[PDB]
Amino acid sequence: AQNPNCNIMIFHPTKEEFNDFDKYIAYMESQGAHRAGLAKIIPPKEWKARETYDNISEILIATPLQQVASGRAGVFTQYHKKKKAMTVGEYRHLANSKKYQTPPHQNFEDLERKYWKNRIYNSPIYGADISGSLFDENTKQWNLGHLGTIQDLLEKECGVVIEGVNTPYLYFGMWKTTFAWHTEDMDLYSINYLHLGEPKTWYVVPPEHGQRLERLARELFPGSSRGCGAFLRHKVALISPTVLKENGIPFNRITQEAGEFMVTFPYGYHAGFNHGFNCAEAINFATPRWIDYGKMASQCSCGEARVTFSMDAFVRILQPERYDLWKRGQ
Ligand SMILES: Cc1csc(CNc2cnccc2C(=O)O)c1
Ligand SMILES: [Co+2]
Ligand SMILES: [Zn+2]
């Protein structure tokens, strides 16, 4: 067995190896990368996503979300309060203001300490889930807007044609903006490129130990658990590394910097936070190995989870028994 300790692996493809996405994901898995639930990929030194980021200020953040915390420093939920629209230019200026700017700190470790100690006492604003892309159309390799669709993967593997399209999203972040503990919709893979700005710290639980985290979550968030049998899909719960360690949950951490890709693997629970103003782009994807995870993925049927048009068909084909009750909830 490759990577038995489930360590987060970091890859440095050559430009030749960077020319076939599916092949390289398969290679990473041949080295056991998926066992961690998350891998970093540093692109070839000659590669770039686009020429410059000089003309991105006019992008609109239609619904910025203020992330309000409730609970204890190391165990809390967050809810998203909708705010008025603003451009990326206005958002960047807000992120850099005295109220929201990254505080003085010695290094990544000091900032992480400050995050977990102080996160709940501030409500940062996140420009999340914005449909669009910052990859240049002429960028041929690892262009997140030119990946094969999950619908085409499902068709190629199962022989059924289905409706739906698969497009990327942009995430404009600031200090303390937070992504809660979750796996992807249908336990798909995700790929995340940090286009610009300050880093993004990630925490991840190995897929083979995902149920340990779920068990702990049920204990730490008893109300949320009773209301929905798959409440982590609401993407509201945070649990600090100190609390994970106290409860024996196996996990790893890694910081992603601008110009680097992260891939999350099927049923790899992850969470994290932004260090300061940044912009990331992400999309879900699938491989042949995902299919069996899709068939087993838990569903939120209480209506709280954000349901996309594309998800209907994946539940319909892969989880026909769940389809009726799931459709009632959403
Ligand atoms: C509405 C909303 C708030 S946080 C979120 C999901 N974000 C992520 C999910 N998986 C990985 C990384 C991120 C991220 O933020 O980089 C959606
Ligand atoms: Co994710
Ligand atoms: Zn639910």
Question: Which residues have CB less than 5 Å away from ligand 2 (the ion)?
Answer: 190
Alpha-carbon gap, residue 275 to 196, rounded angstroms: 12
Method by which the model was determined: X-ray
Q: Is 275 annotated as a binding residue?
A: no
The closest-lying atom of ligand 1 relative to the alpha carbon of residue 65 is 1
Separation in Å, CA 192 to CA 142, 203, 240: 11, 14, 22
Q: For residue 200, how far is its CA from the centre of ligand 1 (angstroms)? A: 11
Residues 6+ apart with CB under 8 A from 208: 6, 35
Determine the residue type at 166. N
Question: Which domain range does residue 24 map to?
Answer: 1-330
Q: What is the CATH number of the domain that holds 243?
A: 2.60.120.650
Rounded-to-integer distance, Cα 192 and Cα 284, Å: 9
| Angle, vertex CA 244, rays to CA 241 and CA 247, nearest 5 | 150
> How remote is the CA of residue 204 from the centroid of ligand 2, in Å?
10
- Our CA dihedral for 148, 151, 155, 160, rounded to 10 degrees, sits at -170
**Of 77, 75, 271, 302, the residue nearest 183 (C-alpha):** 271
- Answer whether 78 contacts ligand 1 (Cβ < 6 A): no
128 ligand 1 Cβ < 6 A: yes
DSSP annotation of 161 reads -
Whole-angstrom distance, CA of residue 279 vs CA of residue 317: 35
Q: Give distance in angstroms: CA of 268 to centre of ligand 2.
A: 9
Residues flanking ion ligand 3, Cβ below 5 Å: 228, 300, 302, 304
Q: Give the integer Cα–Cα distance in Å for 64 and 68.
A: 13
Resolution in A: 2.0
| Cβ atoms 47, 15 nearer than 8 A | yes
CA 304 to ligand 1 center in whole angstroms: 16
Distance 281 CA to ligand 2 centre (A): 11
Burial class (CB within 10 angstroms; exposed 0-12, middle 13-18, buried 19+) of 309: exposed
Looking at the DSSP bridge assignments, the partners of residue 201 are: 255, 273
Left (φ > 0), alpha (ψ -120 to 50) or beta: where does 71 sit?
A: left
Query: What is the count of structural domains for the chain?
Result: 1
Residue of 38, 125, 171, 281 to mutate, ligand 1, most atoms within 8 A of C-beta: 171
- Please list, residue by residue across 4-27, b when 16 or more beta carbons sit within 10 angstroms of its beta carbon and e when fewer do: eebebbebebeeeebeebeebbee
Burial class (CB in 10 A: 0-12, 13-18, 19+), 105: middle
Q: Which residue among 79, 179, 253, 307 is best mutated to probe the pocket of ligand 1, counting the most ligand atoms within 8 A of its Cβ?
A: 179
